[PDB]
Design a protein around this ligand. Structure first.
Ligand SMILES: [Mg+2]
Ligand SMILES: [Mg+2]
Ligand SMILES: [Mg+2]
Lengths: 223, 206, 318, 106, 141, 143, 67
RNA sequence: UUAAUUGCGAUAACGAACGAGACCUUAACCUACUAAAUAGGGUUGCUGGCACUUGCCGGUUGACUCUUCUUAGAGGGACUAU
């Protein structure tokens, strides 16, 4: 109550960001991807998308409930004005963040890095994306550090179609000799868009004309 | 011929200066002959202007500068030195004053005098720094009419500015004097002197 | 042919675009309402003083795109225009005012047609549909005619005594000319004949004759009251406008080259109209977009791409 | 019973334009359905929130700047109705991202 | 019921809204008559829509201008533009077309800005410089 | 056809008003005259000394006539200019508010200026009449 | 400054090849045709294409052209 | 040739991709829409000052209506067009 409208909006955004950060921190093992916030009448609706839904759920109100409580404690809401909903991230390959997380996990486990990257690329391809680009920056054998670059397919780089179709992810992986950085790009198919433009702006495709046998001298159809 | 008034009554002077002649600040743009073959089409006059302040899109193309009333150009030139820079109203005022001064002395159209000055301070042959390697030796070269006009405009203004540097003689008076000197080729004017020097240099280099 | 050797009189100038349509009122003879690409509408009144056969009266600035077809009412008070901004505007001629804005067409409106009563308006647009309007701004019959563009709709005049149905023909980029009736409220006949693309289908003062022409370089005349096939002329070049006259069995056709004039049933391809221009290279040349005959059968009014409305007059050889 | 016509002002605020427009359309439709005294969706001048940051974290380099801007769309609608009806109208037609706000009463 | 139209004039930021009405022949700027304005040296600019086409057209047309935005010179220009527009507009509406055309011709021959509003608008400033194009002083010692 | 202040060359009108005030003697001079700055960012008091506070008053009155509601702060803002802050760029500095206030008070006393609703000051009918008269006089002089 | 790209010129050429009958001369009509037939994403691009087509048409009515 | 490996061309290369361009934000036009007492007007109430004939400048969210300026939605518009 009684706060400037622009300011309020800003605060909302900030809150959202904070929430996202929190989710990233907590639900890393479950494979968190995205948050949605709906400030409807009475209740605020937080929709979570994670790779492991069951885990998130817990003992049907063990982990989710705890999370809710934490949220309440933090932003100061009533016990019953926050609801949480775990969801399937539809096509895990089309999510860059998820891919990044997976890569990180693999690294932690101790997989061959190049191989892992290749696998990721393959997965992306399967998911049906136009292009994948994976940059792995850091010290990968020997002290003098180098960024390795594993790519396939299309990719754009410049223009406003970048924020439209290219989805990006950056996650830093901690190992006992130094930090790695995993940067993953996915070029989503323009035709399979749902909301927004259905092609790249430069792409012009013309329709084909129909066959003609026209003349054969006047005549009239009558009713 | 025929003064008719309205609801908001206009002063008589304004009424007088209307339909027959489109006067400048307060006298005719007519008469005023370009008394030189060349510098025609490159000195404007012709189109009768009221004030030496139009909006203007004169640096847009290439020769849009040539289709600008000469008075306006003069004003623009005057406008120079960073302390003075901007403030075109002041320049206009100065120009007006100069015109008045000209009218007062030797009569004529002041515009005509100005035109004459412009004509007779534009150098006919210039020298470009062409070395053929890097030596400071110079080469004799012909001058474009537009260039001649432009330089002339610059020179007088510069002279006026110089005169104004520590003087009671308000710039306008100085400018008028310069114009007078130019129109009746004097060698007491600065611009004319400069032109002469340039000519001499050209002659030497040829 | 015989006598009438047409002479250029005036070059009516005051536009900044292609004069795409001109029309004289069904009752009044002195008016000529000129519609153009420069969104304007200039009303011309016949003066008959020196070169100026007509001088401008009223410009109707109220459109955002090309004013394509203009049709005057039965008397000479209302003028209806069809614009490339998806709307039509009904204008009051003596005033300088608009009246009705016609919302409905989901595409640029090409041609307008008012009835002999000035009661029921009908319009064709680059939209695939033809629409029925009234003198308020209200939709009646929405004709789902052609599968491609509709180009020209003009209502035919009738004298032989009443039916309850008024008739018109719909030109298209569909290759098929189609006749309608309105109060069966629907089709009369399909006049399949054109091989390329139709620009103009124009009815005559006769009513039972309606000429069809376009990009084909040919003029296929159709018989209406018998609902049957008829004459086919060659014109070499694309026909931009067709015009019948109250003078003879004349047919005046505006080609891409110039203006070609024929006799209808005694098929002689007679007089051509071409004026002079300044400069110019090869196969360009300003061609006449739209031409109108006066109700007298005396004056040809020809609107050009060069913005000028050129006036041709009847002058007998002897 | 309940029907006493008040003075109702409804505020709409968002960052997404299209969504806001949709919401407005919905509201208008509702109004039409209920056919009441109506003042149109009055549009207030869009508020651009500006930020300027040196692109660098450290400070070294050619001094390059950012212009991170957030545009706010604020639009209001005026209705003369009973309050219950207004509530009913506004309880539905809610899209995530758009803030629906009610002043209610004179 | 009186024949009247609402034409504006724009320069840089300045806007001048002139209401052209049927009547006696008033030309007023911000409530004050045309005879004032008072940058004074630019007074003749505001007179240029009057005297170029003549006071003959002004005998029946009343002009009430409200001027806001810009500076002084710009405002004056805007006012002038508005004045130029207004008569023409009136002619188009309530007089005749030929006359309007003539007026336009008169205007068009002397100065362009009277009908076509000026294209030019301030270029935005960008970083690393004082103005839009002018950078800071770079130094290599 | 009718005269008002809005139809007069401004400076001349102001001068006339000042003259009228002088003739009257009536206003109330507070006695800050020949001591004060006018604007707190100035290098000098007035270059007329004896008077010109009358002139200021007249100007204020004119301003009031022109507008609806005028205050003290606003007046200060109007009348202040750019103070030379030394080897530092100039800034807009508001005029001496007390002087303005005094002027307003004087006007009120006279019966020219009147305290308004919402806040600030407007014009009295007598004041308006006086202004009109002044304008007429100016016009006559011009003629 | 103004030189047309591959994505304009090639497209225009293709259009011409497909639709020389019904793609004629003047600009506005051509533009409309382009809008109807081609699946052009931007407006400006479409406009450019139309312009190019018009130019090509103009060139044609003075002799044949390569490609 | 172009601001551009931008094109026209020449041609053991042919057809492509990234970058450039396209794009997007913004700045320009809109008497054409859709709108407003959180923008501005018009008439008109009451009302203040004028000349004193009707006329001129005013103060008032008193009415009624309008959208040119205003804001901002949807469009259009330039493609180097003729
Ligand atoms: Mg690219
Ligand atoms: Mg780019
Ligand atoms: Mg100083």
């Amino acid at each position: 109550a009684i706060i400037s409208k622009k300011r309020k909006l800003v605060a909302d955004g900030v809150f959202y960001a904070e929430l996202n950060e929190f989710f990233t921190r907590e639900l890393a093992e479950e494979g968190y991807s995205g948050v949605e916030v709906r400030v409807t009448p009475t209740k605020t609706e937080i929709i979570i998308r994670a790779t492991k839904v069951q885990d998130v759920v817990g003992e049907n109100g063990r982990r989710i409930n705890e999370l809710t409580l934490l949220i309440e404690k933090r932003f100061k809401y009533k016990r019953g004005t926050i609801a949480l909903y775990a969801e399937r991230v539809h096509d895990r390959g089309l999510s860059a963040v998820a891919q990044a997380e997976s890569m990180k996990f693999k690294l932690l486990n101790g997989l061959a890095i190049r191989r892992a990257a290749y696998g990721v690329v393959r997965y992306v391809m399967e998911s049906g994306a136009k292009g994948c680009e994976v940059v792995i920056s850091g010290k990968l054998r020997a002290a003098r550090a180098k960024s390795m670059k594993f790519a396939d397919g299309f990719l754009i780089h410049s223009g406003q179609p970048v924020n439209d179709f290219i989805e990006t992810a950056t996650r830093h992986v901690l190992l006992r000799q130094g930090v790695l950085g995993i940067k993953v790009k996915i070029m989503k198919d323009p035709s399979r868009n749902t909301s927004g433009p259905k092609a790249l702006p430069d792409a012009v495709t013309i329709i084909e004309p129909k066959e003609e046998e026209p003349v054969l001298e006047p005549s009239v159809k009558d009713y | 011929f025929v003064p008719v008034e309205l609801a908001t009554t206009i002063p008589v002077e304004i009424q007088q200066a209307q339909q027959e002649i489109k006067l400048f600040n307060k006298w005719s743009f007519e008469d005023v002959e370009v008394k030189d073959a060349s510098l025609v089409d490159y000195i404007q006059i012709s189109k009768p202007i009221y004030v030496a302040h139009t909006a203007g899109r004169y640096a847009n193309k290439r020769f849009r500068k040539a289709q600008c009333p000469i008075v306006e150009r003069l004003t623009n030139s005057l406008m120079m030195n960073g302390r003075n820079n901007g403030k075109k109203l002041k320049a206009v005022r100065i120009v007006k004053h100069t015109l008045e001064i000209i009218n007062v002395l030797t009569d004529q159209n002041p515009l005509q005098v100005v035109v004459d000055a412009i004509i007779n301070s534009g150098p006919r042959e210039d020298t470009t720094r062409v070395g053929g390697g890097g030596a400071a030796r110079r080469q004799a070269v012909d001058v474009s009419p537009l260039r001649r006009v432009n330089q002339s405009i610059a020179l007088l203004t510069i002279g006026a500015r110089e005169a104004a540097f520590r003087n009671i003689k308000t710039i306008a008076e100085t400018l008028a004097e310069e114009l007078i000197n130019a129109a009746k080729g004097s060698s007491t004017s600065y611009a004319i002197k400069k032109k002469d020097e340039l000519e001499r240099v050209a002659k030497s280099n040829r | 042919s015989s006598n009438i050797m047409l002479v250029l009189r005036g070059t009516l100038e005051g536009h900044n675009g292609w004069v795409t349509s001109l029309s004289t009122s069904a009752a009044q003879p002195n008016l000529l309402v000129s519609g153009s690409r420069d969104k304007t509408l200039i009303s011309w009144r016949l003066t008959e003083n020196e070169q100026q056969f007509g001088v401008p009266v009223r410009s109707y600035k109220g459109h955002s795109h090309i004013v394509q077809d203009v049709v005057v009412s039965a008397d000479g008070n209302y003028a209806v225009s069809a614009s490339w901004d998806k709307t039509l505007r009904l204008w009051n001629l003596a005033t300088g005012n608009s009246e009705a804005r016609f919302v409905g067409h989901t595409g640029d409106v090409l041609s307008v047609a008012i009835d002999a009563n000035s009661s029921k308006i009908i319009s064709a647009s680059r939209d695939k549909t033809i629409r029925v309007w009234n003198t308020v701004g209200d939709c009646a019959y929405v004709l789902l005619g052609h599968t491609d563009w509709v180009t020209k709709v003009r209502v035919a005049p009738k004298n032989l005594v009443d039916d309850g149905r008024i008739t018109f023909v719909s030109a298209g980029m569909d290759k098929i000319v189609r006749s309608w009736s309105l109060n069966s409220y629907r089709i009369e006949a399909d006049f399949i004949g054109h091989n390329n693309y139709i620009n103009v289908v124009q009815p005559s003062p006769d009513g039972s004759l309606a000429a069809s022409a376009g990009k084909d370089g040919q003029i296929y005349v159709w018989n209406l009251k018998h609902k049957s096939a008829f004459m086919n002329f060659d014109a070499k070049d694309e026909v931009f406008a067709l015009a019948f006259s109250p003078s003879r069995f004349w047919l005046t056709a505006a080609t891409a080259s110039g203006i070609k004039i024929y006799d209808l049933e005694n098929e002689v391809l007679i007089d051509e109209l071409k004026p002079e221009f300044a400069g110019y290279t090869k196969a360009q040349d300003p061609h006449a977009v739209s031409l109108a005959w006066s109700a007298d059968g005396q004056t040809l009014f020809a609107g050009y791409t060069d913005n000028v409305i050129r006036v041709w007059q009847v002058m007998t050889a002897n | 019973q309940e029907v006493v016509i008040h003075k109702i002002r409804i505020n709409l605020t968002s960052t997404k334009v299209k969504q806001l427009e949709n919401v407005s359309a919905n509201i208008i439709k509702n109004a039409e359905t209920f056919k009441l005294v109506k003042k149109g969706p009055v549009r207030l001048p869009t508020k651009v929130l500006k930020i300027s940051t040196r692109k660098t974290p450290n400070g070294e380099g050619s001094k390059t700047w950012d212009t991170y801007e957030m545009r706010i769309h604020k639009r209001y609608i005026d209705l003369e109705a009973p309050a219950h009806i207004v509530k009913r109208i506004t309880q539905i037609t809610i899209e995530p991202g758009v803030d629906v706000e009610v002043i209610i009463a004179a | 019921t009186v024949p009247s139209v609402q034409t504006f004039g724009k320069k840089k930021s300045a806007t001048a809204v002139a209401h052209v009405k049927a009547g006696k022949g008033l030309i007023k700027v911000n409530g004050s008559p045309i005879t004032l304005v008072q940058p004074e040296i630019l007074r003749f600019k505001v007179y240029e829509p009057l005297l170029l086409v003549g006071l003959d057209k002004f005998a029946n047309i009343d002009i009430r201008v409200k001027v806001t935005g810009g500076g002084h010179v710009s405002q004056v220009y805007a006012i002038r533009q508005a004045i130029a527009k207004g008569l023409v507009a009136y002619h188009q509406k309530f007089v005749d077309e030929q006359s309007k055309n003539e007026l336009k011709k008169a205007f068009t021959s002397y100065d362009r800005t009277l009908l076509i509003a000026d294209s030019r608008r301030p270029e935005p400033k960008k970083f690393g410089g004082r103005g839009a194009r002018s950078r800071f002083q770079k130094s290599y010692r | 056809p009718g005269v008002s202040v809005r139809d007069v060359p401004a400076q001349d009108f102001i001068n006339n008003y000042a003259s009228f005030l002088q003739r009257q003697g009536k206003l109330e001079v507070p006695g800050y005259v020949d001591i004060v700055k006018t604007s707190a960012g100035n290098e000098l008091p007035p270059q007329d000394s004896e008077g010109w506070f009358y002139k200021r008053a007249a100007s204020v009155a004119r301003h009031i006539y022109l507008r609806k509601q005028v205050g003290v702060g606003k007046l200060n803002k109007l009348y202040g200019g750019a103070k030379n802050r030394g080897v530092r760029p100039h800034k807009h500095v508001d005029a001496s508010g007390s002087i303005n206030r005094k002027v307003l008070q004087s006007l009120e006393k006279l019966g020219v200026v009147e305290i308004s609703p919402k806040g600030g000051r407007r014009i009295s009918d007598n004041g308006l009449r006086d202004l009109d008269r002044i304008a007429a006089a100016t016009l006559e002089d011009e003629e | 400054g103004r030189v047309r790209t591959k994505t304009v010129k090639r497209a225009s050429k293709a259009l011409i090849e497909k639709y020389y009958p019904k793609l004629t001369m003047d600009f506005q009509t051509n533009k409309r045709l382009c809008d109807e037939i081609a699946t052009i994403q931007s407006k400006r691009l479409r406009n450019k294409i139309a312009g190019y087509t018009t130019h090509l048409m103009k060139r044609i009515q003075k002799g044949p052209v390569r490609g």
